[PDB]
Amino acid sequence: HSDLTFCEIILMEMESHDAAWPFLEPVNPRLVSGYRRIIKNPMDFSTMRHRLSRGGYTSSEEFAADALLVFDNCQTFNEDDSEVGKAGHIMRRFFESRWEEFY
Numbered sequence: 525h526s527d528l529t530f531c532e533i534i535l536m537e538m539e540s541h542d543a544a545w546p547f548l549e550p551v552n553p554r555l556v557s558g559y560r561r562i563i564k565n566p567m568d569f570s571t572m573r574h575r576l577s578r579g580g581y582t583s584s585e586e587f588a589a590d591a592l593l594v595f596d597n598c599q600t601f602n603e604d605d606s607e608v609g610k611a612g613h614i615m616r617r618f619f620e621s622r623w624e625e626f627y
């Protein structure tokens with residue numbers, strides 16, 4: 525229970541972060557050419573929110589695996605110096621630093 529209690533804290537903190545704007549909602553493949561071809565397993569914060577809401581996280585490791593998938597997919601598709609990429613690095617570093625502050 526305290527496992528998923530820390531996940532609520534960090535997801536709420538990521539949900540409200542300045543640099544979270546590329547990750548609050550699923551990428552729209554109709555708007556992003558080549559996205560479905562390149563990104564096999566899309567992931568985003570609202571999908572993690574939904575899954576946390578309906579209780580579909582058994583351990584805290586599953587939650588972190590979805591979070592890292594967001595920034596993996598981000599680095600796979602965007603240049604590090606693009607504006608999404610820049611936001612993803614800020615968000616990736618935030619997540620790891622907060623995650624280690626508990627574990």
Ligand SMILES: CN1C[C@H](Nc2cnn(C)c(=O)c2Br)C[C@H](c2ccccc2)C1
Nearest residue numbers: 545546547549550551552556601602608
């Ligand atoms: C849903 N969400 C997905 C988009 N995130 C993106 C867009 N393009 N690429 C290549 C990505 O990797 C991501 Br994540 C950002 C979009 C938006 C948000 C704010 C302002 C402009 C666009 C709204």
